[PDB]
Enzyme design. Sequence first.
Site, PDB file in Angstrom:
ATOM      1  N   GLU A 108       1.134  -1.476  -0.082  1.00  9.52           N
ATOM      2  CA  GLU A 108      -0.263   0.084   0.246  1.00  9.52           C
ATOM      3  C   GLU A 108       0.918   0.848  -0.083  1.00  9.52           C
ATOM      4  O   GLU A 108       0.553   2.453  -0.633  1.00  9.52           O
ATOM      5  CB  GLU A 108      -1.025  -0.293   1.186  1.00  9.52           C
ATOM      6  CG  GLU A 108      -2.103  -0.766   1.379  1.00  9.52           C
ATOM      7  CD  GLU A 108      -2.855  -1.102  -0.146  1.00  9.52           C
ATOM      8  OE1 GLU A 108      -2.841   0.108  -0.601  1.00  9.52           O
ATOM      9  OE2 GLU A 108      -3.845  -1.491  -0.186  1.00  9.52           O
ATOM     10  N   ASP A 158      -6.209   7.494  -1.026  1.00  7.64           N
ATOM     11  CA  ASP A 158      -6.097   6.907   0.636  1.00  7.64           C
ATOM     12  C   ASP A 158      -5.249   7.632   1.032  1.00  7.64           C
ATOM     13  O   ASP A 158      -4.389   8.279   0.681  1.00  7.64           O
ATOM     14  CB  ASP A 158      -5.141   6.050  -0.356  1.00  7.64           C
ATOM     15  CG  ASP A 158      -6.209   5.629  -1.342  1.00  7.64           C
ATOM     16  OD1 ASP A 158      -7.870   5.106  -1.536  1.00  7.64           O
ATOM     17  OD2 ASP A 158      -6.023   4.595  -2.245  1.00  7.64           O
ATOM     18  N   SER A 194     -11.789  10.392  -4.274  1.00  9.37           N
ATOM     19  CA  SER A 194     -11.096  10.190  -2.963  1.00  9.37           C
ATOM     20  C   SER A 194      -9.799   9.976  -3.251  1.00  9.37           C
ATOM     21  O   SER A 194      -9.139   9.953  -3.770  1.00  9.37           O
ATOM     22  CB  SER A 194     -11.688   8.876  -2.337  1.00  9.37           C
ATOM     23  OG  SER A 194     -11.450   7.928  -3.362  1.00  9.37           O
ATOM     24  N   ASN A 250      -7.561   9.035  -5.440  1.00  8.38           N
ATOM     25  CA  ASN A 250      -7.918   8.173  -6.348  1.00  8.38           C
ATOM     26  C   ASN A 250      -8.937   8.697  -7.916  1.00  8.38           C
ATOM     27  O   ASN A 250      -8.937  10.264  -7.632  1.00  8.38           O
ATOM     28  CB  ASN A 250      -9.701   7.089  -5.673  1.00  8.38           C
ATOM     29  CG  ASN A 250      -8.645   6.151  -4.399  1.00  8.38           C
ATOM     30  OD1 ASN A 250      -7.472   6.211  -4.731  1.00  8.38           O
ATOM     31  ND2 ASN A 250      -9.107   6.741  -3.520  1.00  8.38           N
ATOM     32  N   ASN A 265      -8.829   4.772   2.157  1.00  9.13           N
ATOM     33  CA  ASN A 265      -9.730   6.151   2.021  1.00  9.13           C
ATOM     34  C   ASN A 265     -10.638   7.250   2.396  1.00  9.13           C
ATOM     35  O   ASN A 265     -11.618   7.002   3.180  1.00  9.13           O
ATOM     36  CB  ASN A 265     -10.310   5.146   1.319  1.00  9.13           C
ATOM     37  CG  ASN A 265     -10.784   5.729  -0.334  1.00  9.13           C
ATOM     38  OD1 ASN A 265     -11.135   6.925  -0.473  1.00  9.13           O
ATOM     39  ND2 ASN A 265     -11.675   4.869  -1.052  1.00  9.13           N
ATOM     40  N   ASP A 312     -12.124   8.431  -8.912  1.00  4.76           N
ATOM     41  CA  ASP A 312     -13.701   8.701  -8.181  1.00  4.76           C
ATOM     42  C   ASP A 312     -12.888  10.230  -7.996  1.00  4.76           C
ATOM     43  O   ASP A 312     -14.109  11.081  -7.182  1.00  4.76           O
ATOM     44  CB  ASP A 312     -14.366   8.183  -7.244  1.00  4.76           C
ATOM     45  CG  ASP A 312     -13.680   7.626  -6.200  1.00  4.76           C
ATOM     46  OD1 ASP A 312     -12.575   7.935  -5.742  1.00  4.76           O
ATOM     47  OD2 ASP A 312     -14.602   6.755  -5.436  1.00  4.76           O
TER      48      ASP A 312
HETATM   49 RU   LIG Z   1      -6.890   2.511  -1.743  1.00  8.69          RU
END
Ligand SMILES: [Ru+3]
Length: 129
Positions: free
Chosen positions: A35, A52, A50, A46, A59, A48
């Site tokens: 990650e 992380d 959003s 992201n 998120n 969309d």
């Molecule tokens: Ru992610």
Amino acid sequence: KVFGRCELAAAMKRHGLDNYRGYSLGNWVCAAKFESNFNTQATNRNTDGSTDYGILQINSRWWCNDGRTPGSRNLCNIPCSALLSSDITASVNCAKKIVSDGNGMNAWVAWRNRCKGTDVQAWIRGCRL
Ligand SMILES: [Ru+3]
Ligand SMILES: [Cl-]
Ligand code: NA
Ligand SMILES: [Ru+3]
Ligand SMILES: [Ru+3]
Ligand SMILES: [Ru+3]
Ligand SMILES: [Ru+3]
Ligand SMILES: [Ru+3]
Ligand SMILES: [Ru+3]
């Protein structure tokens, strides 16, 4: 902060992730490796809109507030910035909520694709824990 592998394993154990919801410590270290490459300051936007955050790439769509994810929730009741701290408390506490919410560690797509069903115990091999 960029944690060493064994450093993070030790920290995660102290913070109660060792077999949390039946996920052995190696799962959590593996998830963090892929990650964030163990970097608490990791952020990734992201598609969309959003973002992380942190060592476990939590998120803003669901779990934290960053003030710029329209329609989102903040189910961990934290600023997303709390997830970037050198102290992993906020990340760990939120991850506990996430992994308990039905899908286990499948919530972390990198865990499903890179850790799930592998010898994750390798990630803590050699570490003083
Ligand atoms: Ru992610
Ligand atoms: Cl599960
Ligand atoms: Na949010
Ligand atoms: Ru600590
Ligand atoms: Ru253990
Ligand atoms: Ru143990
Ligand atoms: Ru829920
Ligand atoms: Ru729930
Ligand atoms: Ru082995």
